[PDB]
Amino acid sequence: DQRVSMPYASKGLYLETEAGYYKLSGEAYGFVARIDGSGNFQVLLSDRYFNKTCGLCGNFNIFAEDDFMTQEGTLTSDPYDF
Amino acid sequence: SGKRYPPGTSLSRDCNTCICRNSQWICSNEECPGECLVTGQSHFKSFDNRYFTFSGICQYLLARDCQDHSFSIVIETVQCADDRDAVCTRSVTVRLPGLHNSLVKLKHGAGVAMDGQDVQLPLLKGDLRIQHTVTASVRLSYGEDLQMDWDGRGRLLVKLSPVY
Amino acid sequence: DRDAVCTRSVTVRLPGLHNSLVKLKHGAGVAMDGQDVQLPLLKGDLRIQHTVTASVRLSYGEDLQMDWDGRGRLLVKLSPVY
Amino acid sequence: ACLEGCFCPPGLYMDERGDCVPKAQCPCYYDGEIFQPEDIFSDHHTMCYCEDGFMHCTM
Numbered sequence: 567d568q569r570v571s572m573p574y575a576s577k578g579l580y581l582e583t584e585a586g587y588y589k590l591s592g593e594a595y596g597f598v599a600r601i602d603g604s605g606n607f608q609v610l611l612s613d614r615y616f617n618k619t620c621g622l623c624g625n626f627n628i629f630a631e632d633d634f635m636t637q638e639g640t641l642t643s644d645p646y647d648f
Numbered sequence: 649s650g651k652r653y654p655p656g657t658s659l660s661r662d663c664n665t666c667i668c669r670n671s672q673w674i675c676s677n678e679e680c681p682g683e684c685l686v687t688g689q690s691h692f693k694s695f696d697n698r699y700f701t702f703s704g705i706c707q708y709l710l711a712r713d714c715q716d717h718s719f720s721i722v723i724e725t726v727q728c729a730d731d732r733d734a735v736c737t738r739s740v741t742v743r744l745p746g747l748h749n750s751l752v753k754l755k756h757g758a759g760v761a762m763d764g765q766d767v768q769l770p771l772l773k774g775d776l777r778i779q780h781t782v783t784a785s786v787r788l789s790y791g792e793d794l795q796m797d798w799d800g801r802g803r804l805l806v807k808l809s810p811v812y
Numbered sequence: 813d814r815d816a817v818c819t820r821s822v823t824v825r826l827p828g829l830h831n832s833l834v835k836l837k838h839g840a841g842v843a844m845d846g847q848d849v850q851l852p853l854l855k856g857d858l859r860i861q862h863t864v865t866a867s868v869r870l871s872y873g874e875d876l877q878m879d880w881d882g883r884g885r886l887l888v889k890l891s892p893v894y
Numbered sequence: 895a896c897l898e899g900c901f902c903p904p905g906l907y908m909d910e911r912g913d914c915v916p917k918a919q920c921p922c923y924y925d926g927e928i929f930q931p932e933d934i935f936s937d938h939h940t941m942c943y944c945e946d947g948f949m950h951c952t953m
């Protein structure tokens with residue numbers, strides 16, 4: 567809840583600005599998030615989580631049709647209740 | 649429990665009584681009723697005051713008389729939220745071979761259903777009585793050796809007397 | 813008075829289903845074969861449900877209706893097949 | 895038909911306890927069982943929930 571300044575580097579998470587746009591790097595944990603001026607979230611994520619992750623950005627597999635596997639595990643046709 | 653009592657007193661647990669004589673409580677060892685408890689998501693209590701958790705999704709057997717067959721209770725678990733670690737009780741099914749070999753069912757509300765038929769409470773049959781308690785919770789009472797509690801949102805109880 | 817003879821209950825009998833015996837009681841209550849029942853009661857043919865939540869309505873098939881016998885205002889609807 | 899009795903306005907629907915409520919907290923009656931307005935619910939194979947009065951099941 568405490569507002570901190572920026573940059574910031576605690577716990578292996580460097581919270582920087584790159585190219586006028588804000589970045590949150592976690593290379594120890596395997597991810598690089600960022601936001602632009604308009605507001606457009608982006609998540610670059612390593613191949614270590616191939617077949618492993620699941621969430622609102624889908625699993626990191628090769629296929630693109632099966633990547634709505636709900637928190638139970640259910641291939642749903644709807645992109646919304648997912 | 650960290651407080652002093654004079655001699656001759658008789659404090660009573662829920663189970664039995666104990667009396668102070670020569671700095672040594674004398675106590676009886678007569679049995680006292682047990683309570684299996686389902687509640688919360690998946691949190692069980694055995695009759696012997698054990699606590700544990702088992703988040704399975706099927707029709708499990710909660711209790712049963714096992715030398716004769718006066719009854720048998722059957723819990724029915726389902727997942728109950730988005731998470732996978734959330735498995736609440738939906739219904740429980742009771743079976744009385746002493747009366748018609750009937751089949752009572754406590755539903756996800758405060759409702760009861762004997763042999764498919766919904767029923768208005770009370771239900772004085774010969775042995776078993778089913779009635780509300782606060783008008784928000786059902787209570788089965790077969791004979792004088794069995795009680796139950798509401799399985800609407802999943803807080804089943806039992807009262808088994810020492811004859812079991 | 814002696815010139816006051818109201819209806820207390822009515823008893824219906826369906827030989828087509830179990831040779832059962834329905835009973836409409838002095839309230840809005842119903843009792844099949846001694847057992848009180850919560851409404852609705854969709855068995856195969858006969859439906860019993862409230863109407864305004866103050867009056868019962870039996871409906872056997874499509875050729876028979878009834879009405880509340882609580883305070884004594886029984887009705888029937890018999891279709892021309894009878 | 896167009897019957898006569900005690901109703902409540904079209905935004906409100908009738909609850910079991912005599913009060914009538916909007917369709918947000920209007921429970922579901924799946925398989926007879928009275929489920930609350932938010933009850934996620936599933937065996938292994940099926941997946942069902944109660945949104946606003948209706949029981950949205952899938953497989």
Ligand SMILES: *[C@@H]1O[C@H](CO)[C@@H](O)[C@H](O)[C@H]1NC(C)=O
Pocket residue numbers: 616617627
């Ligand atoms: C993903 O993991 C599952 C479960 O271990 C395995 O069955 C499957 O072959 C894996 N698929 C890929 C693309 O690695």
Ligand SMILES: [Ca+2]
Pocket residue numbers: 624625626627628629630631632633
């Ligand atoms: Ca994919």
